[PDB]
Amino acid sequence: SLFELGKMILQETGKNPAKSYGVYGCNCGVGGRGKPKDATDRCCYVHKCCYKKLTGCDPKKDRYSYSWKDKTIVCGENNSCLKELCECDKAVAICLRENLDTYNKKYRYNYLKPFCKKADPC
Amino acid sequence: SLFELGKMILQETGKNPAKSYGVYGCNCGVGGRGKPKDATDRCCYVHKCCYKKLTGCDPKKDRYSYSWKDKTIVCGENNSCLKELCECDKAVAICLRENLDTYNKKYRYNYLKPFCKKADPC
């Protein structure tokens, strides 16, 4: 769920998930996908695409087990869907962190997501 | 559109709309409605309901004219839906502004809007 996702992003990036990625670019946070504005945004793009593919569980609300072991998100062996969900979340948290170097505050508070160029299909 | 809306919110509240109301509470910013966390959130609640009554225009993207006259949002005539849209946006900007005094930064960055109690029907 967003609980785990939020925590992962926090654990990885060291950033407040909602603050730094709640309305970032065309893909981070709620809204759907749009043309990624940068690497950070594409993390979220990929992440949402990851969600799209998920069947059998709710990415937003379904809880799952993961742990923070040796500063690594380790998804619990939940079930197939929740594991994928966890891995989606882990991936984006890692991705967001990996792309903190190009994280652009200019993209941080995007009130204009619907005006993002349409996203390619996932 | 979110251009006018954001601008209205800015003009009324002085606040960066996406920062302060992009992810605030259960109702502000993208996402839908939820039980308002407070008066600010309830503005957005009312706003989103206001949107629900619109037909013939896209509240997110359809631009419309309004002027900032005597520190008042004055909706241009536009057309019926855009006028009504503008009035929705005006109302929430005003409401957001009116409720700055209880604007709670602890609701500002809600990564968990899906976990908000379900909104009442509009």
From Swiss-Prot, chains A, B:
Site label Cationic membrane-docking site (MDoS), positions: 15, 19, 113, 118
Record region (Important for membrane-damaging activities in eukaryotes and bacteria): 105-118
Subcellular location as annotated: Secreted
Residues the UniProt record annotates as site (Important residue of the cationic membrane-docking site (MDoS)): 105, 108
Activity-regulation annotation: Myotoxic activity is inhibited by suramin and rosmarinic acid. Cytotoxic and myotoxic activities are inhibited by pre-incubation with varespladib. Suramin inhibits this myotoxin by (i) direct blockage of the MDoS and MDiS, preventing the toxin/membrane interaction and disruption and (ii) formation of an oligomeric complex, resulting in a tetrameric configuration for which both MDoS and MDiS becomes physically inaccessible, thus avoiding any possibility of toxin-membrane interaction or disruption.
Annotated site, Hydrophobic membrane-disruption site (MDiS), chain positions: 112, 115
Disulphide bond pairs: 26-116, 28-44, 43-95, 49-122, 50-88, 57-81, 75-86
Tissue specificity comment: Expressed by the venom gland.
Disulfide bond recorded as keyword: yes
Gene Ontology molecular function terms on file: calcium ion binding; calcium-dependent phospholipase A2 activity; phospholipid binding; toxin activity
Key words of the record: Antibiotic, Antimicrobial, Disulfide bond, Fungicide, Myotoxin, Neurotoxin, Postsynaptic neurotoxin, Secreted, Toxin
SUPFAM superfamilies with a match to the protein in the record: Phospholipase A2, PLA2
InterPro entries in UniProt: PLipase_A2, PLipase_A2_Asp_AS, PLipase_A2_dom, PLipase_A2_dom_sf, PLipase_A2_His_AS
Subunit: Homodimer; non-covalently linked (probable alternative/compact dimer conformation).
The protein's name: Basic phospholipase A2 homolog myotoxin II
Provenance organism: Bothrops moojeni
Taxonomic placement: Eukaryota, Metazoa, Chordata, Craniata, Vertebrata
